[PDB]
Amino acid sequence: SELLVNTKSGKVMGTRVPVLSSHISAFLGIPFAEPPVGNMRFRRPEPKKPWSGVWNASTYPNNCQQYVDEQFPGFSGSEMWNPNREMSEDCLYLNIWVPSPRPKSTTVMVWIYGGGFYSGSSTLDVYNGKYLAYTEEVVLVSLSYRVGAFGFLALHGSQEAPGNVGLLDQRMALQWVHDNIQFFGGDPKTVTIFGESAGGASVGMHILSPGSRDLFRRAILQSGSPNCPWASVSVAEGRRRAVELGRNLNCNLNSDEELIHCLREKKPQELIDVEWNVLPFDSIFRFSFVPVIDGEFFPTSLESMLNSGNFKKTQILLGVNKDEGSFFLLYGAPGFSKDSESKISREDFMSGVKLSVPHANDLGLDAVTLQYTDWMDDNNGIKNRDGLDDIVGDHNVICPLMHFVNKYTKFGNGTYLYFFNHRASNLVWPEWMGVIHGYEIEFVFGLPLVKELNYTAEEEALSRRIMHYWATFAKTGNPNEPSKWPLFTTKEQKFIDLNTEPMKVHQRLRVQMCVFWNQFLPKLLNAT
Amino acid sequence: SELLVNTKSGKVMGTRVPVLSSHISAFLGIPFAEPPVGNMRFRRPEPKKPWSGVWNASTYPNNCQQYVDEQFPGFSGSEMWNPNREMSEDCLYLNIWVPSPRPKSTTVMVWIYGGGFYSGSSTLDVYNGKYLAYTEEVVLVSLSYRVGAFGFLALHGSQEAPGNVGLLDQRMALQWVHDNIQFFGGDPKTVTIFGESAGGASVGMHILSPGSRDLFRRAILQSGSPNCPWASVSVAEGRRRAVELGRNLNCNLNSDEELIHCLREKKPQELIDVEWNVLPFDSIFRFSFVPVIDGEFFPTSLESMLNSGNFKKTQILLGVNKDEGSFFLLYGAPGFSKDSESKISREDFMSGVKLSVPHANDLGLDAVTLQYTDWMDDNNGIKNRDGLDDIVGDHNVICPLMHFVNKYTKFGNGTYLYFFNHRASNLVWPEWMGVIHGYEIEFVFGLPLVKELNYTAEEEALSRRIMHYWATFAKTGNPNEPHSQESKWPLFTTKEQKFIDLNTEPMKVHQRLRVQMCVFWNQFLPKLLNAT
Ligand SMILES: O/N=C/c1nc(CCCCNc2c3c(nc4ccccc24)CCCC3)ccc1O
Ligand SMILES: *[C@@H]1O[C@H](CO)[C@@H](O)[C@H](O)[C@H]1NC(C)=O
Ligand SMILES: *[C@@H]1O[C@H](CO)[C@@H](O)[C@H](O)[C@H]1NC(C)=O
Ligand SMILES: *[C@@H]1O[C@H](CO)[C@@H](O)[C@H](O)[C@H]1NC(C)=O
Ligand SMILES: *[C@@H]1O[C@H](CO)[C@@H](O)[C@H](O)[C@H]1NC(C)=O
Ligand SMILES: *[C@@H]1O[C@H](CO)[C@@H](O)[C@H](O)[C@H]1NC(C)=O
Ligand SMILES: *[P@](=O)(OCC)N(C)C
Ligand SMILES: *[P@](=O)(OCC)N(C)C
Ligand SMILES: [Cl-]
Ligand SMILES: [Cl-]
Ligand SMILES: [Cl-]
Ligand SMILES: [Cl-]
Ligand SMILES: [Cl-]
Ligand SMILES: [Cl-]
Ligand SMILES: [Cl-]
Numbered sequence A: 001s002e003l004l005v006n007t008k009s010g011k012v013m014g015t016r017v018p019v020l021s022s023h024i025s026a027f028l029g030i031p032f033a034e035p036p037v038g039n040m041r042f043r044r045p046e047p048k049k050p051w052s053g054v055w056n057a058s059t060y061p062n063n064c065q066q067y068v069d070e071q072f073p074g075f076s077g078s079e080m081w082n083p084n085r086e087m088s089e090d091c092l093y094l095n096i097w098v099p100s101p102r103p104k105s106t107t108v109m110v111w112i113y114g115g116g117f118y119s120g121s122s123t124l125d126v127y128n129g130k131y132l133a134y135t136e137e138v139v140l141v142s143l144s145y146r147v148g149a150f151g152f153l154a155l156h157g158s159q160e161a162p163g164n165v166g167l168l169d170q171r172m173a174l175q176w177v178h179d180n181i182q183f184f185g186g187d188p189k190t191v192t193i194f195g196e197s198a199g200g201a202s203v204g205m206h207i208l209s210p211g212s213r214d215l216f217r218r219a220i221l222q223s224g225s226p227n228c229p230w231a232s233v234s235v236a237e238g239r240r241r242a243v244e245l246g247r248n249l250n251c252n253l254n255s256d257e258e259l260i261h262c263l264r265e266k267k268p269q270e271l272i273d274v275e276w277n278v279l280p281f282d283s284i285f286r287f288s289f290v291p292v293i294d295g296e297f298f299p300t301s302l303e304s305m306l307n308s309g310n311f312k313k314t315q316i317l318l319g320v321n322k323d324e325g326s327f328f329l330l331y332g333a334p335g336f337s338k339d340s341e342s343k344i345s346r347e348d349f350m351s352g353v354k355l356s357v358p359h360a361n362d363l364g365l366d367a368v369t370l371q372y373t374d375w376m377d378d379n380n381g382i383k384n385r386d387g388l389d390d391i392v393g394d395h396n397v398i399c400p401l402m403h404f405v406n407k408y409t410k411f412g413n414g415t416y417l418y419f420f421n422h423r424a425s426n427l428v429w430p431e432w433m434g435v436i437h438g439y440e441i442e443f444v445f446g447l448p449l450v451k452e453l454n455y456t457a458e459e460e461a462l463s464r465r466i467m468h469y470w471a472t473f474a475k476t477g478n479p480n481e482p483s484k485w486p487l488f489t490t491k492e493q494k495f496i497d498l499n500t501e502p503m504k505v506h507q508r509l510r511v512q513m514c515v516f517w518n519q520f521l522p523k524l525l526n527a528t
Numbered sequence B: 001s002e003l004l005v006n007t008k009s010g011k012v013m014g015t016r017v018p019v020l021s022s023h024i025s026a027f028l029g030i031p032f033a034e035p036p037v038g039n040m041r042f043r044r045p046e047p048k049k050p051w052s053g054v055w056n057a058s059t060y061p062n063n064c065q066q067y068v069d070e071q072f073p074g075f076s077g078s079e080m081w082n083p084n085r086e087m088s089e090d091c092l093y094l095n096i097w098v099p100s101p102r103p104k105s106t107t108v109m110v111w112i113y114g115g116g117f118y119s120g121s122s123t124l125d126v127y128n129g130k131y132l133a134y135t136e137e138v139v140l141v142s143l144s145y146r147v148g149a150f151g152f153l154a155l156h157g158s159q160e161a162p163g164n165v166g167l168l169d170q171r172m173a174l175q176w177v178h179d180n181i182q183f184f185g186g187d188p189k190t191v192t193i194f195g196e197s198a199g200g201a202s203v204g205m206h207i208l209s210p211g212s213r214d215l216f217r218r219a220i221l222q223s224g225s226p227n228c229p230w231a232s233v234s235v236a237e238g239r240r241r242a243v244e245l246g247r248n249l250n251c252n253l254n255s256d257e258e259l260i261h262c263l264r265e266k267k268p269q270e271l272i273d274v275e276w277n278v279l280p281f282d283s284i285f286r287f288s289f290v291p292v293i294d295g296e297f298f299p300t301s302l303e304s305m306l307n308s309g310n311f312k313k314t315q316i317l318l319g320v321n322k323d324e325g326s327f328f329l330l331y332g333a334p335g336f337s338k339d340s341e342s343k344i345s346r347e348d349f350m351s352g353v354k355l356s357v358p359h360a361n362d363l364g365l366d367a368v369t370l371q372y373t374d375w376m377d378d379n380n381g382i383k384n385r386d387g388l389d390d391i392v393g394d395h396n397v398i399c400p401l402m403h404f405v406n407k408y409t410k411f412g413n414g415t416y417l418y419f420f421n422h423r424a425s426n427l428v429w430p431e432w433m434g435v436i437h438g439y440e441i442e443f444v445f446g447l448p449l450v451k452e453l454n455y456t457a458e459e460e461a462l463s464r465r466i467m468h469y470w471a472t473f474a475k476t477g478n479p480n481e482p483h484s485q486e487s488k489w490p491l492f493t494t495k496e497q498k499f500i501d502l503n504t505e506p507m508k509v510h511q512r513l514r515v516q517m518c519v520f521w522n523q524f525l526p527k528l529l530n531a532t
C-alpha cells in the first residue's frame, strides 16, 4: 500500500490528504529520536529505538515547550506562529509529504522552522507541505528540534548539557532522512535543507559543521545566516546565562552537575516563565538560548571558518525580505504601535539605536546615528521610523547575510541571491511594517494557489514561480530551465527581486550600509 | 587740494586715477609702521615715525617677501595671484581709494588678502578698490601684513619672535585707519573689515582678539574663519617648526636668542626656500607659519572663546564658494591635472584622503572614505574626483565656517550667510575645478563692470548686486535696502539657518548648508579621534 511504508525503526501508516482537486500522501508525526525527557533533558538526542507495530502517523505531532506570544490575543497575524498543537518535551518528530502516485527516487526538501531558537513548530498552517510536494512533485519533509533552554542551554565542559543540542536534533532528523527517505520515494543523494530566520541560520550552520555536511546536498537560506549576531553566543556567555537562569529560579550554583539537576526537576513552563531574565543588555532584540561556538559542533570561530573555506562547497540560494526589522520594533521599541503609523520622534529614535545595537559604546552609537539620519529633516516621524527599521533589518539580517554570501561565494559551486519585496494583498499587519519577514513562506509553500485564501491572481502566479525556483534549485542546483535568474559572482554581485512584476537584476544588495555594518563599525568598536 | 591730506603721521600726496568714464582719488603705498627689517624681523610692528615733507602716495608699495607660485609660468590664472611689485621686508603699507568729490563721514571697508598666511599682496589687479569705492561711495582700504615665517614664526615666551606679528601688523594698520581715515572722509565709527581665505580667518581672529575688537564695527568673512584647521597652531607646534626651520638652516638651536640671531642674518629667500620643510606631514591645504594660540592675542582656545561668547558682538556677513578644494588638489594631489578632466582612480582617491586629513589614524580615514563614497560605483573617476574636492572643501573651509557661524550667531547681533556658486564665464581653469576659491573676489571688487575684461552682462549685474549687498551691509549692518522690492536676503538664525545663493539666476533661500558632512566634520570625526 502507498501509506504502508516500513522504516528502519518500525512501520508507519499515513493518510490520504486532499490537495487542489487531487490528493497526496502525508506521513505526520514520525519520531526520529527518543523523547528528550527527564535524565535526557538538555541532552544530545538519541535515535528512536525501533518499535513493533504500525505507527499511526496520521496527525501532526506535539510542539516543543516554548514561550507563547500573547501580545495580541486572538490576532490572526501573530497567532499563525503560535503552537497549534499541545506542547510537550516529547516533540522530536518529522512530517513527510509524498506525491501520489509514489515517486521513484525523487528530490527531497527538508524544511527547518525559525522563531529565534526560542519558538517554532513544524505544524503551522504556512508550513503545510501538501502544496509544494504536489505542485512541484517533490518529497517534502519538515522536521522539529527543541528550542529555548530545552534546546540550547550550554555549559561547555558538561556532557549532560553541552549546548547546540537542538542543532543535533535537526541533524538526527537529517540522518533519519538519509537513512529512511529512499522508502518514501525520496532520493537521499539529493536532500535540500531550507529554513527561514533561525531556520536560515541552522541551514548555514549545517553547511559549516562537519558533522552535518554529508546529510544534505544543497541549501536554501531565507532571511537567515549563521553569522547573524542573534544566532550564536560564545562559550562563556551561554554559561553565564545558564548559571543565571539557575539563580533566577534559585538553584544550586557551586558547579554544574547540581545546577543541571535543579533544572531537570523543574516543570517546562517554569524555565519559560523565567527564560528572558538572563539577557545581558536591555537590547530586547536578543534571545536567551541559542547555538554556542563550542569548538566541536563548530570547530572554530565562524569568520575563520568562512575565510578558511572550512564548510560544504555546494549550491546555495538565499535572500532577504525588504523589512526584516518591523516585527522586532513593534514588540519592543518606543512609539511603535500596530495601530498607528508609528511615526518616531527623534528621542525615541535615539533610544532605538541604543537598543538596536546592544553593545555599542557611545562612539559606536553616534556612528550608527549619523549613517541613518537625514539632518535636513531629522524630526520627520516617518523617516525616523523607517530609518530605525532599516537599522534593525540591516544590522540583524541583511548585512550579516551579505557578509555570508560574499565569503561563501569565493568557495562554493554556485550562489543565487533574491530580494523579496512584495507585500501580500491580504496582510493583516499595518502598512508601515512593509514586507515583514516570514511572509515569503506563504509563497514558498504555495498558499496563494488556494482560492478561498483570497490571494490575487498575480500572487498565485508569483507563488508558482518561487516554488519552481526553489524546487528546480533543489533538483538541479539552479532555479532555471533552459527568463533566467543570474548567478551571483564574487566580482559582480547580482541578485533579483521577487515580486508580482517581471524579474529584474540589480547588483550589490544594500552595499552602502553593509560596508558600514561589515567593515567600518566592527573596526570602530574594536578600536574603542 | 583733494589729493593733499594732512594726517597724524605726516602729509600724503595722492593721485587722481580714472574709473568707468569718471575719476576717483587714490592714496597708494602709505606707510603705517616702521619697516620690519634688521633686528626688527619677527618682532611686533612699531608705528611709522612721523615724517616731514609730503609723502608721495601715488604708486603701489612693495609686497612682503613670500613664496612665488611657478607651477604654470605665464598662466594668468595662477600668476594673477603672484606678487606684481618688488618684494621686500619693507612692505607694511596700505592703500586708500576715496570718492571724488570727497565724502564727509562715509563707510570704510578694509580688505585683508588671503594667501594661506604664506603669501598675498595688497596690490593685485583683482583687489583694485577703484570700482568699489566708486560705485558704492565707500572709502576702500587694502592693507598688508608679513606672511610666512616673517609674519608668524613663533617662539612663545620670547619677545623677539612672539608669533602673530603678522596679525599685529593688520591691527596697527587698523589702528592707523581709526586715527586718520577721518582725514579722507571716512567714518572711523563705521569701518567694515573683510577678507578672503586666510584674509577671512584674520577677520574672524579680530572678532575674537580683545585688543582688536574696538578698531572696526562690522565684519565680513569669505571662504575663511578663525577656527579652520590650517589657520592656527599651538605654542608647542609653532616652536618645533621655528626650531626645525633653523635646523634646516644649520642654526644654533641651544636657545631662542641664538636661534633668532641666526635666523635674522639669513636672507629672505633662504627662509622661503625651506619654509615647507617644517611641515609635520605630507599635506595639501597646510602651511608652515600661521597664527598661534599664545594666550595674548588669543586669551584662550578659539573654541572656548566661541562658547563663552568671548568675542565682538556685531553683524557678520560671511560665506563660501562651491569648490573650495579644487585649487589645492591641482597643486598637491595625485591624478589632478590642469589640462585634463582629472578622473581619480580609487588608489589616487585613498591617497588624497590621507593628504587631506594628515592628522587622522586609519579609523579616521576609513570614516572619511566611507562617507564620501558611492559603493554602488566606487571606481567612477568623476565621482571620485568630485568627492575628493568636496572632502577638501568641507574639511578645510565649509564646515569650519559653518561651525563658526553657528557659535557666533548665538551671541552676535545678526548673521547673513551666502553660498557663492557662479563659475565666471571667462575662467582660465578647467571645468572640473568648478567655482574656484578666490573667484568670488572679482565680483566683490566689481571688475565685471569693465568692458574689456569680457564678462557676461549678467556677470556685471551680479557683481553690482554683490557690491551693493556688501557696501549696504558695511553702512547699515544689513545687506538689504528697506523700502526696496528686490527679494530679501534673510537672516541666518540660530536655527532656521536660512542662507542664500549668489549667482546670475534669481535669489533662492535655502536652509542648513551641507549639514550632513558638517555634522560629520564638526561633530563626529573629532569625537572619533579623541577616542583613538
Ligand atoms: O521584544 N520584546 C519585548 C518585550 N515583551 C514582553 C512581553 C512579556 C514577556 C515576553 N518576552 C520577550 C522578551 C524579549 N523579547 C521578546 C521577543 C518576542 C517575544 C517575546 C519577548 C526581550 C526582553 C525580555 C522579554 C516583555 C518585555 C519585553 O521587552
Ligand atoms: C489514527 O488516529 C486518527 C486520529 O485520531 C484516527 O482518525 C484514525 O482512525 C487512527 N487510525 C488507526 C489505524 O487507529
Ligand atoms: C562547479 O564544479 C564543476 C566541477 O567541479 C566545475 O566544472 C564548474 O565550473 C563549477 N561551477 C561553478 C558555478 O562554480
Ligand atoms: C611720485 O613718484 C612717481 C614715480 O616714482 C613720479 O612719477 C611722480 O611724479 C611722483 N610724484 C611727486 C609728487 O613727486
Ligand atoms: C540687535 O540689538 C538690538 C539692540 O540690542 C536688538 O533690538 C535687536 O533685536 C538685535 N538683533 C539681533 C539680530 O540680534
Ligand atoms: C575681449 O573680447 C574682445 C572681442 O570683442 C577681444 O578683442 C579682446 O582681446 C578680449 N580681451 C580679453 C582681455 O580677453
Ligand atoms: P527569526 O527566527 O524570526 C523569529 C521572530 N530570527 C530573526 C530571530
Ligand atoms: P587661503 O589664503 O587661500 C590662498 C592659498 N587659505 C584657505 C589657505
Ligand atoms: Cl485545499
Ligand atoms: Cl535527576
Ligand atoms: Cl566535506
Ligand atoms: Cl511589488
Ligand atoms: Cl565588495
Ligand atoms: Cl577703467
Ligand atoms: Cl630652543
Ligand SMILES: [Cl-]
Pocket: B409, B410, B492, B493, B494, B495
Ligand atoms: Cl538667533
Ligand code: NA
Pocket: B254, B255, B256, B257
Ligand atoms: Na631658551
